[PDB]
Amino acid sequence: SVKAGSAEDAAFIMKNASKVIIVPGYGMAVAQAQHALREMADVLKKEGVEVSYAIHPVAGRMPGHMNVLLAEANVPYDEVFELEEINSSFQTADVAFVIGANDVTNPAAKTDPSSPIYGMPILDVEKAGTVLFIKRSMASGYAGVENELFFRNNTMMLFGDAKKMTEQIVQAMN
C-alpha cells in the first residue's frame, strides 16, 4: 500500500541506468520545472546515457501544452516523441521518470471498464524497470481516479513539488 522515497533515492535509481525516458505532465507545468527537468537530463545524458521524452497528446491542460514548455527549456525536437512513436521503448527502459504526469499513465484505461479515463490511449510506463513519479500528494488528477500504478512493487512516490523535487536530484547528481 504505497512505497515512499526521497531525492537521494531517486538520484540513485536513475543514476544507475543506460536508457532513461522522461514523461512530463500538467504537474511539470504548474511548477514550471521545464528548465530544471531539462538539466536533470543533460547532466543525465552526460554520463553517456540515452534520454527521451514521451509526450502524451493530452498531457497538461491544452494541445501542445508539454511542447511549448519543453521548447522554452531548449530541449531538442529530435528527442521529444509522441505516444505512438515511443510507447514501445518503455520495456527496454530502466527508469520511467514521471514528472507531474498521472492520468497519462493510469492503467485503468485498458482495464477497469467504467473508469472516466477508459478507452483513452496511455503510455506504457509500467513496462519500464523502475517508475519514479513525483507529486505534492496523493490526490488524483483531472480524471478523479486513483492510479493503481501508484502503490505497487516497482513504483516510487517522490512527494513534493516538481521543480524542487527535480532541483535537488540534479544536485545529488553532481
Binding site: 504548474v30 514550471q32 491542460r61 480524471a143
Partner: protein, 366 residues
C-alpha cells in the same frame, strides 16, 4: 463502401474535410475515397497530392456525392432556403458527418431528414477521455488561439519581445487574455513565447493554476487572500489600461457572447491598442466589434475576423480529417466492407441528430 469529400461552399471557408494521410487509412479500412476537385486547394492539399494517396477526383460536387455512402464536410451543408441545395446532392439514406450546428440550425436537420440521411453532428461529441481524439471543438479552437495572437501581432505597431539595443530599449508588449478555454490557453502560450507580459482572467476559479502553468499571471483582487465582489472588474480594468493587445475568447453555446469589454472600457485604452474578439460571431465580447472586419474607435483597433480556424486552414484541415476518421474507424469492420454505428456507443448516441427519416436528438422537438 464509398465516401466522398466535397469542396466547402460557405464563403471564406478554406478548410477541407480530408487529408493525404487520412485517405490511405480510409482505403485501408475498405473505402473507395472520392473528393471534389480543388477541394483541398485552400488547405494546400492538391488533387495530385490527394490522388497519390488512393483518392479519385470527381470534377463537380454532384458527381462526388452522387452515389457516396458516407459524406464528410466541415461546415453544415447549405439548403435550398440559402440559395444552394447541397443536401439534395447527398444520396438518400447516406451518412453525413460534419460540424452541423444542429442544436442551432433545425432547418438543415429537417432538410437531411427528408432525404433519410443519418447525420452525426461532430460538435456534440461527448466530453469523455476516449473521445478527445474525436473532438473538433478543441482541435480548431486550439489553432484559433494560436492565430488570435498572430493576427494581434500583425496589427500591433510594436514588437512583442523586449529588445535592448545600442540605440535604446523597447519594452515588451502587454497581452491580456479574457477567457481561459483551449483557445485562450494557446494564446497565452503563443504570446509568452513571443516575449510579451501576459495577463489573463476567467470566471472559473480553477483557472488561475492553468494560467500560471503557462507563465501567465492571473488577475486576482488582493483586498485580502483567496458582500459585492463585483469590484474585481477594477483589477481587470487596472490591467486593461496598461494592455497593448486584448484577446477575448469567451463563448456560451446557443446563447449570445457575454460582454467582457464595454465601449466604456475601450475608451480607457491607450492608442495603438488592438482587441482581438474571437467571440465576434456570437455577438462579441466587445460590442464595438463587427463580424468580418477591423473597426477603429478611440484609437483602438477592434479586430473581428470570422472563422479563425480557417485562417490556419493548412493545419486545421488535417486535424479535422483526423477527428472524423477517429470517429469512424471503430465502426468499419470485416462485415465485407460495411460500417455499423453501435447504438450503444455514447459517441454515436450523443452525436447522431437524425436517423433514416426521423429526428433523433432529444433537444430537437423530438
Amino acid at each position: 463502401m464509398k465516401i466522398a469529400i466535397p469542396k466547402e461552399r460557405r464563403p471564406g471557408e478554406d478548410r477541407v474535410a480530408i487529408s493525404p494521410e487520412v485517405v490511405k487509412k480510409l482505403v485501408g479500412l475498405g473505402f473507395e475515397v472520392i473528393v471534389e476537385q480543388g477541394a483541398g486547394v485552400g488547405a494546400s492539399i492538391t488533387d495530385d497530392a490527394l490522388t497519390a494517396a488512393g483518392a479519385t477526383i470527381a470534377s463537380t460536387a454532384a458527381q462526388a456525392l452522387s452515389q457516396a455512402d458516407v459524406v464528410w464536410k466541415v461546415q453544415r451543408p447549405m439548403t435550398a432556403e440559402e440559395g444552394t441545395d447541397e443536401v439534395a446532392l447527398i444520396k438518400e439514406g447516406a451518412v453525413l458527418m460534419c460540424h452541423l450546428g444542429a442544436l442551432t440550425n433545425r432547418p438543415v436537420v429537417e432538410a437531411l431528414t427528408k432525404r433519410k440521411i443519418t447525420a452525426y453532428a461532430m460538435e456534440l461529441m461527448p466530453r469523455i477521455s476516449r473521445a478527445q481524439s474525436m473532438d473538433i471543438l478543441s482541435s480548431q479552437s486550439n489553432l484559433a488561439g494560436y492565430r488570435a495572437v498572430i493576427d494581434g501581432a500583425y496589427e500591433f505597431a510594436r514588437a512583442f519581445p523586449m529588445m535592448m539595443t545600442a540605440a535604446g530599449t523597447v519594452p515588451p508588449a502587454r497581452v491580456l487574455v479574457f477567457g481561459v478555454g483551449v483557445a485562450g490557453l494557446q494564446a497565452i502560450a503563443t504570446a509568452k513565447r513571443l516575449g510579451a507580459v501576459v495577463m489573463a482572467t476567467d470566471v472559473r476559479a480553477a483557472t488561475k493554476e492553468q494560467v500560471e502553468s503557462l507563465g501567465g499571471k492571473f488577475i486576482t483582487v488582493d483586498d485580502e487572500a483567496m458582500e459585492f465582489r463585483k469590484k474585481q472588474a477594477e483589477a481587470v480594468l487596472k490591467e486593461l489600461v496598461k494592455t497593448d493587445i486584448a484577446i477575448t475568447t469567451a463563448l456560451i453555446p446557443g446563447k449570445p457572447a457575454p460582454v467582457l469589454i464595454t465601449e466604456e472600457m475601450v475608451t480607457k485604452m491607450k492608442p495603438g491598442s488592438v482587441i482581438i474578439d474571437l467571440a465576434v460571431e456570437a455577438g462579441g465580447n466587445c460590442p464595438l466589434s463587427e463580424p468580418g472586419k477591423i473597426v477603429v474607435k478611440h484609437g483602438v483597433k477592434i479586430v473581428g475576423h470570422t472563422n479563425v480556424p480557417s485562417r490556419v486552414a493548412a493545419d486545421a484541415s488535417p486535424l479535422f480529417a483526423k477527428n472524423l476518421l477517429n470517429f469512424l474507424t471503430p465502426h468499419v469492420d470485416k462485415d465485407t466492407k460495411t460500417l455499423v454505428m453501435k447504438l450503444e456507443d455514447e459517441t454515436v448516441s450523443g452525436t447522431c441528430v437524425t436517423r433514416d427519416g426521423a429526428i433523433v436528438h432529444p433537444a430537437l422537438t423530438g
